[PDB]
């Protein structure tokens, strides 16, 4: 209780609980199918938003009131944050965290310097790690903040930058393997363009592919076993980011033979910024077999930039979780809270309140989706809707016995064709009924 | 001059011309590189917007004043339109048109009936064709208007509909081959979803692929030589259309081994509705080697639906044409005016005025792009910008002599890395200078 | 049971009900504060979407399967629809309907003709009305469908059209007064522009104002007592509609002295299309004292056009209803279901299913908002948040005792200023708790 | 040449000029109607973007290479910037600049401290001012950057903040009057909301109005003669900003009796972010008689946040300038370049290149608009389009001799009504012709 003395370890208080520092729906311990609820959800904290971020926006200064802000020595701060991390996870009941290499340790004048400094904090992280139960869900290299990357990393126009980026990723892969990460994420924040006038699209996409596979070859050369995750985003900071979305990123991987090595880390706000719903992007990832992990936030659909808010909407969490359950639940991934407090929610307790809200909403949603999937209510409607492809000519079609000519013959004279209603208004009311059903079974 | 007696054949009148029924920039005959300008641009009329469409919008009745509207007998109208088509192209100087099978001939009670009726008009089209110089750029089947397709065509939930759709496409391929079309287009207008709740995404995408290849196999079985074009659109009428954009459609083709057979027909308004610029979508198509053809319109970026306006913006036409020239110009495609007059531009002369405006804008843009490409002004800046990948470690990288380890070695101690400016503000002013340059060389 | 023989009168079946033709949350009879629930909500059917509309979209033909479609004589159909209206309301338990003058009766060759034809159906409506309990919530003139209005009605460039529009509105006001309407709505569907190039903005806004007040003067001259409602919409069909939103329309009214006579009919989908949330638009209307009535639908935030879906989202209905309750509930207005079935929900039962879903969602939302308002949970937080304006200099400010000079004096030396957290993450979790609370008290 | 030794004073080099540090269209000295071109345009630099801003974006560190960055003492930097300002304006040929109070001088621990520090730099600004020809177009107080304003300034929930804000504005008004500013701008950057849950909309709007008028009363008490400008913005940083746009802000002013004292400073990117075109917002301001000044930038319509780019599009500059000319040109306002270089355009020469590009584009646009307005080409079409309101019943309507009854009489039997085409496709081609015309008359 050194850092956040006023915050106690958080416990479950049930559906009617009134205390803001209590879980209303998330019972970490509750077992479902022989697994405690915590092992279904695999909640994780994002080091960047929670410990580094201080409420600065394009028009304003940082607002956050954080304990480690007294330490003015960059290294004291870096260490203070590592300690706060573990205390935070302990009280909030979390067992996973994610970080960028540049989140944990300040940079030196050279890469060598930088790496040395980096090792210092990594070692401290490992001590507190084994003393605790928190683990590394995934690690990643920040290839977008430093001016060096203004024209991109792998897609830069400067070979020196390409080299630096390859070296940084190398280190990042190393410390991730050392800390036992389940995955390694690629967010191409500057891998895109601001204008086509100065962009050799084809060249940049080639270098990007060379980079990706150099990374997969080195992962082999060091016996790294984590899952490689690509995190799509349509834009911001760039005008167009290359991994625009699942389908686009897939197209690039498949196109260059890199797909077998990658899965996707889908973020709600990224999905909606590309004009897709969160569910859509999850389903796509799923049928491709690459639903890797999830960054659990929530954007504002009436705003054109990532708001990165804590998820407080049961409709979204339900449809999201429905996809995960149908994919078979998580393997080497989970619900990393890539979200942040509103600038005005600047008090330390708001960090806690925010994370609790997200966990409750996702927990409840998981439970609603669990019923939907168990009763099989949606799966039956769908099975009935595409019924004709099981009987008659339908099956001939699917099996491949038919061609255009045989289809013309079959259909040439048929006058009226019978069609099912879509029932959308009905299905939606159903989601409401299951929300009500589940709430009634809540403790 | 039977249909549009008040409109004379349109001729070039030069840059300072004042008459709205005159080309100011488009000189059909002007030869560039041994080809008249008309053979670079390959302008084409869209039968649907020009002859069938009458200004109806979701909130209002049709407004168009068209000659063929006296004929109340559906067939008289169908024939009246075929005649107007050729007169229109003659006066407006156009040599290509595109049509949907359901644009040219009313439907019967059965497919057989429908096909018979269809043959009647196709024959009349062929007579007037050989008597004229207009040709079929591409044909396509309307698989979205008739209620039968409310749940899609290839992605329908009813095998009967799948069959009907296969049969209709079969006929469409036939009459396209007969009329000598350069290509056959697929617009999946209803090939998408309105809700995921009733959608088996994976199944629909499978049937879609079966369909596409049945179509390519039958194209073989009839010695059809036209290019198969897929026309991407992100949405409308659907919430999500499967061929969302170039990259997405590519991903699906490549994923199912259908890519070698297809190229893309890119439409400005579709590009921008998916959150892309027209140029972006053209460049993508280009580096994939599938810049097939273009539907030349212009959307309104502040409106969320296809406005389908005539292109009157030289910046857009310049960047668009720049991509075509760099792709090597058209082969089996061209600038089909998939655009329509504003509801209030309901007079017959507005049809002409609209098409002239689009042709001028595209002609001028072609000329600006032609200079940009000739002076090689942009290509030099780009060649200089990625220079480091030719010298030193840069080339080692590209050639594949380097790995992460060797890159770490090279970069481990480098303190400062030198970067070029992006020059975006400069490049943009350049586009302005070339617009001014070209205008000064205009007759 | 003549028209919809297969549909029985709908009754309440409770929260756990499974039957799609049953209310789960809406108990018409349940009394709250001495009023049955039906008198709080005042649900109403929209004649246009339910009886006239048949599922036609810009890319497709109508799909709806409706009983009255056998009658091919326009008048038989017009009468068949009036009968269906009352049967529909009876079974679905609704007591109000809204209509456009052009929804109920086909048009003649002249206004005189048209009015005669109109009287025929109005009389039939009045008979079945007194035989039933359904009433007219509000009436309105369709000033956008007929080609005559392509350039607007009051904002047209043709004085003849202005005249026709004034005459049509006159008739509309008359039959509304005759049928006992509670209000008369103005939707300026064509009162806007598609381009500024041909628009004399100032003139059109002047004629619009002349029109509005001619209408208020004639309402006096006939002793009409209904509330005049303006229904804002940012666009569609126009590029820009003049009554863009509450604030904009207010600005125009206030600017021309017409505000005292009008209130607003707020539509969810219109609010969100203008970049506002439904709640925002309701609150604005409320503090202006002009929260007149509501068109209860739900748009799709990822689509740029009115989807006009049935409301199935409890978050929206809760925040919406919260505003109504705080405004004091309805007076001369209610929840008109200006929504329509999805094109694929083409069966008659879907009309019922759709309306039931909307009513349930709005009923439940009303109940959640009712608790929020009763416990006063939000009002207390707000009272505490702006506390400093009650004590000290705060009150001096509000009362007007202070000026800049006195404020400079008070503040010139104050070093640190204490600020409250915004608690957004907290407040949102609260809305979730009240949804859960209310569901537990549900029968 | 101390700060930017490598940049010479910029001169006009004409339409065919190739040198990026030369004006191609902007000839400062060229007289039009007895005024040099510089007095029509009144170009101005924004202190914030040019001197303070360094290319930092939400995902990245600052990139800018600026001379004054060696000075690590905050005050040395503050003074270094004032010197650079005047050198910049001299070389770039600019005679006006705009600044925020917090742009020019670092803040102290108390307001008193802060004001003292502020006076130091203001005095240095005044010396170099009288030694030069640059003037203050407008000044403004930064009421959004400092944490104190996280809940707003005038709309804050803390009376202390309200007081501080009133005091800061007081000082700002003072130094603006001292430096001879033509206007004083209000940008309510934090005057809006992020959530309605914690917002007493009515109260905040009341305090906002109290504030505005306290400001107008003190402007009187000090004999300030500059024009008060309100600068609308729909959002960012807030979810909803109160002065959403011209009409909304107008509504609030008019509603509280503050309108007679204010005019609008319209910004392109703000207009388009609210779903309006730049021209639309200018026309509105114009017919209200409050087209005060312009912030000349250009947003990216496919991005949902302010990009604040330098204007390089002649279509936009033409329609914008067309409105200014029609308003009668500038009085106490001008074209302040509230724009910034792309992050990658980090070299000092790019600052110059960017500003030159904007000035050329606006100069050329001014010239195109000047012809449009002189030939009166658009005004004639419009005069002809609304012709019927001059003759017959049309005039009776406008003059107010008509009512609904007389209009019913006039129109009751009229069968067909004749309507003009809208000619949009024609008018747009015209804008192209005038762009070509003007370019040919360019030196
Ligand atoms: Co400690
Ligand atoms: Co994100
Ligand atoms: Co993320
Ligand atoms: Co003839
Ligand atoms: Co289209
Ligand atoms: Co098209
Ligand atoms: Co009957
Ligand atoms: Co609507
Ligand atoms: Co409505
Ligand atoms: Co010096
Ligand atoms: Co701005
Ligand atoms: Co500004």
């Amino acid at each position: 209780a050194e850092f956040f003395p006023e915050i106690p370890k958080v416990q479950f208080e049930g559906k009617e609980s009134t205390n803001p520092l209590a879980f209303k729906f998330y019972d970490p311990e509750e077992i479902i199918d022989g697994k405690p609820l915590k092992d279904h959800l695999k909640f994780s904290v994002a080091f960047w938003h929670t410990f580094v971020n201080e409420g600065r926006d394009p028009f304003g200064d940082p607002t956050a009131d954080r304990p480690w802000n007294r330490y003015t020595d960059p290294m004291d701060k870096a260490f203070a944050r590592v300690d706060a991390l573990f205390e935070f996870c302990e009280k909030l009941n979390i067992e996973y965290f994610c970080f960028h290499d540049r989140d944990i340790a300040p940079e030196g004048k050279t890469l060598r310097e930088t790496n040395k400094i980096l090792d210092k904090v990594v070692e401290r992280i490992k001590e507190r790690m084994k003393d605790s139960n928190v683990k590394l869900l995934w690690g990643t290299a920040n290839l977008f903040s430093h001016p060096r990357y203004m024209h991109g990393a792998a897609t830069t126009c400067s070979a020196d930058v390409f080299a630096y980026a390859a070296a940084q990723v190398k280190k990042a892969l190393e410390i991730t393997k050392e800390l036992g990460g389940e995955g390694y994420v690629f967010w191409g924040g500057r891998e895109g363009y601001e204008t086509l006038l100065n962009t050799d699209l084809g060249f940049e996409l080639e270098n990007l592919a060379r980079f990706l596979r150099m990374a997969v070859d080195y992962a082999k050369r060091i016996g790294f076993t984590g899952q490689f995750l690509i995190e799509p985003k349509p834009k911001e900071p760039t005008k167009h980011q290359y991994d625009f979305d699942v389908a686009t990123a897939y197209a690039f991987l498949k196109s260059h033979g890199l797909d077998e090595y990658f899965k996707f880390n889908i973020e709600a706000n990224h999905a909606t910024l590309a004009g897709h719903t969160f569910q859509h992007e999850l389903r796509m990832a799923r049928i491709l077999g690459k639903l890797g992990s999830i960054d659990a936030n929530q954007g504002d659909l009436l705003l054109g930039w990532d708001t990165d808010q804590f998820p407080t909407n049961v409709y979204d969490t339900t449809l999201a979780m429905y996809e995960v359950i149908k994919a078979g639940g998580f393997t080497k991934g989970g619900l990393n809270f890539d979200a942040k407090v509103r600038r005005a929610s600047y008090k330390v307790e708001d960090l806690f309140i925010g994370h609790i809200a997200g966990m409750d909403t996702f927990a409840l949603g998981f439970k609603v989706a669990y019923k939907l999937v168990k009763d099989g209510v949606l799966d039956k409607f769908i099975e009935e809707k595409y019924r004709s492809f099981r009987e008659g000519i339908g099956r001939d079609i699917v099996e491949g016995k038919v061609d255009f000519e045989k289809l013309e013959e079959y259909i040439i004279d048929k006058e009226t064709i019978e069609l099912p209603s879509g029932k959308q208004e009905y299905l939606e009311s159903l989601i409401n009924s299951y929300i009500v059903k589940t709430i009634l079974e809540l403790r």
Side-chain angles (χ1 to χ4, degrees), chain A residues 198-220 222-254:
Chain A
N198 62 210
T199 297
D200 180 346
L201 195 65
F203 187 63
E204 294 193 358
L205 291 181
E206 290 317 289
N207 277 349
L208 177 52
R210 280 176 197 115
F211 194 94
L212 269 352
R213 146 164 33 36
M214 278 188 218
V216 316
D217 288 339
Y218 184 67
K220 282 165 182 163
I222 65 169
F224 178 66
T225 58
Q227 183 57 73
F228 269 21
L229 302 170
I230 275 161
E231 183 175 350
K233 188 168 176 186
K235 55 190 161 189
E236 175 154 293
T238 62
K239 191 233 211 302
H240 172 87
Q241 185 169 147
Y242 291 141
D243 304 317
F244 190 83
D245 60 14
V246 170
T248 301
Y250 181 61
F252 168 79
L253 297 179
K254 183 56 174 174

Side-chain angles (χ1 to χ4, degrees), chain A residues 173-193:
Chain A
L173 267 182
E174 285 167 14
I175 77 179
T176 290
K177 180 197 161 173
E178 213 176 283
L179 300 183
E182 283 184 4
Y184 185 81
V185 165
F186 290 88
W187 180 54
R190 301 282 174 189
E191 313 283 42
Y193 69 72

Side-chain angles (χ1 to χ4, degrees), chain A residues 67-108 110-119 121-122 124-126:
Chain A
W68 51 85
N69 263 179
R70 30 179 288 115
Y71 306 84
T72 179
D73 184 302
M75 281 292 281
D76 285 349
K77 208 163 179 174
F79 282 125
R81 285 179 177 139
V82 179
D83 291 345
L85 199 216
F86 295 90
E87 186 185 319
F88 190 84
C89 293
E90 196 168 359
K91 299 185 168 173
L92 227 34
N93 247 292
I94 291 168
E95 296 179 24
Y96 293 94
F97 77 107
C98 295
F99 71 93
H100 290 111
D101 53 13
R102 296 289 180 262
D103 289 337
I104 65 178
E107 227 182 300
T110 71
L111 184 57
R112 184 178 297 287
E113 244 269 56
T114 288
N115 281 173
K116 270 189 186 187
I117 306 185
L118 183 59
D119 286 314
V121 316
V122 172
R124 185 149 286 207
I125 293 173
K126 193 192 295 173

Side-chain angles (χ1 to χ4, degrees), chain A residues 417 419-428:
Chain A
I417 297 174
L419 287 178
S421 178
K423 292 298 164 179
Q424 186 180 138
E425 292 81 15
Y426 175 56
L427 282 341
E428 291 182 2

Side-chain angles (χ1 to χ4, degrees), chain A residues 121-122 124-127 129 132 134-170:
Chain A
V121 316
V122 172
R124 185 149 286 207
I125 293 173
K126 193 192 295 173
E127 293 165 10
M129 246 193 229
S132 190
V134 341
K135 318 186 205 65
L136 179 64
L137 182 53
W138 52 258
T140 173
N142 176 326
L143 302 176
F144 55 83
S145 288
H146 186 260
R148 166 198 315 132
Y149 298 125
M150 65 190 251
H151 300 298
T155 58
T156 184
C157 53
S158 170
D160 279 349
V161 170
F162 187 102
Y164 189 118
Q168 182 176 3
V169 164
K170 174 173 176 295

